[PDB]
Amino acid sequence: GSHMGSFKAAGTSGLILKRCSEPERYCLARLMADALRGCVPAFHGVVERDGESYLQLQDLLDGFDGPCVLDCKMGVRTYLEEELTKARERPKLRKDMYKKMLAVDPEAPTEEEHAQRAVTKPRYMQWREGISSSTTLGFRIEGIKKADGSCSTDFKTTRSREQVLRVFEEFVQGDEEVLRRYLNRLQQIRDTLEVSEFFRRHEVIGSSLLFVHDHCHRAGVWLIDFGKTTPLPDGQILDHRRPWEEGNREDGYLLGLDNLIGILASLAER
Ligand SMILES: Nc1ncnc2c1ncn2[C@@H]1O[C@H](COP(=O)(O)OP(=O)(O)NP(=O)(O)O)[C@@H](O)[C@H]1O
Ligand SMILES: O=P(O)(O)O[C@@H]1O[C@H](CO)[C@@H](OP(=O)(O)O)[C@H](OP(=O)(O)O)[C@H]1O
Structure with missing residues (x-):
């Protein structure tokens, strides 16, 4: 129904406020005009609340009756290359x-x-x-919020393909329709990423795929958190699959998405 760190209740129904970050505001404004428009929360602009700036976002939980939520952090690398320079x-x-x-x-x-x-x-x-699983599979499970109100972040040593599969297996609780809908949405997201003007031009670090389903078999996936997504210099592009080597700015985002689709497709046949 409603998600309600960085978040505040919005005036209008079906919306949520998130603390404005300049990289994230730049990114959401671009994404509303990109192939990826439908794969990210609607961005309605910035509002002032108690003398501070907030992104007015679509509440992704609004369409759902008692949503289950899984947050999947995407990429082989989870920090900017500039952090490596600063630490030296x-x-x-x-x-x-x-x-x-x-x-x-x-x-x-x-x-x-x-x-x-x-x-x-x-x-x-x-x-x-x-x-x-970040280094080997190019994504990791960060957290689950279940329909019973229970939440868990106990995934720091979830690493093997089969360990990841067992978390998704428990998350979907044998609902064949939710899993089929998730796989269809991930296939359509991968296709959109592979043609996106935004995606080929940007290093996508620290973003998540938010999986949301309910007992009515409604299921959605969105990309969220563009707080560390930065444009490549002077018309340089990424393939988002090749290994990261300091200087090349590669994120392994699509290596992650490929492995994630593979694991969900495997679960579907179990
Ligand atoms: N548009 C949205 N609608 C509803 N819930 C959302 C939305 N965006 C984020 N959330 C929820 O809020 C959580 C935090 O999202 P995120 O954008 O990663 O926040 P952050 O605090 O900026 N970054 P992080 O450190 O990775 O948690 C997600 O895992 C969801 O449960
Ligand atoms: O999940 P754990 O193991 O607690 O680690 C945390 O992972 C966040 C990313 O999910 C980082 O956030 P970031 O997106 O890099 O700003 C935090 O870094 P910070 O303390 O804010 O410098 C970091 O402690």
């Missing part, structure tokens, strides 16, 4: 990121990180990518 010239040591690391694998931090009780953001993000 002027590292911001992060003590929070060190404690999250210790918790999952106490042997993961180096002798110096242990001494620092702190890690760089890129180091933490590369580690996160490697213990989840």
Whole structure:
């Protein structure tokens, strides 16, 4: 029915407010005129609320009767290349990121990180990518909100193809119609991405696919979160499949989407 960090209730029905970020505002404005228009939440412009700027977005949960939601972070890389430059010239040591690391694998931090009780953001993000499915499959499950009100973010070590399949298997709860609709939507999204003027021109980092379904077998998928999506310089383009090597700005977005369609197609035959 309604999603209600960055989010606030909107005046108009079926809308949601999200804290304005300049990269995200640029991106949503472009996407409304792109092949991808139908694959992203409708963007209605910016509004002021308590002296601060908000994106007026379509509430993706509005069409659904008690929605189940899964957030899938897309790409082999989850940080901008500029973070790698900043961490070499002027590292911001992060003590929070060190404690999250210790918790999952106490042997993961180096002798110096242990001494620092702190890690760089890129180091933490590369580690996160490697213990989840991000590095190998080019996406990872971030979270589920079920129809019973229960939520989980317990997916940091969800890595193998079969582990990912079991999360989707539990998420769709044997609803053949929801899974068929999800696969049809993902096939149509892949086709739209492969012709999109926006997509060939932009490095898409930190974006998610939001899967939404309900007990009436309504099912939708949208791309969300363009806070780290940046244009390539002087008419350079990405294939979004080839491996990332510092300088090439490749995100593996379509490697991810390919693997995700493969896993859902496998689940459909089980
Ligand atoms: N347009 C939308 N309508 C309804 N729910 C949304 C919408 N956009 C995002 N959400 C929900 O809010 C969550 C956060 O979205 P996101 O755009 O990633 O926010 P963020 O705080 O900017 N980034 P992140 O750090 O990745 O969570 C999603 O996982 C959804 O559950
Ligand atoms: O999911 P966990 O393991 O908690 O890690 C978190 O992953 C976010 C991306 O999902 C990052 O956000 P980002 O989109 O890069 O701004 C956070 O970074 P930050 O603390 O804000 O510098 C980072 O801690």
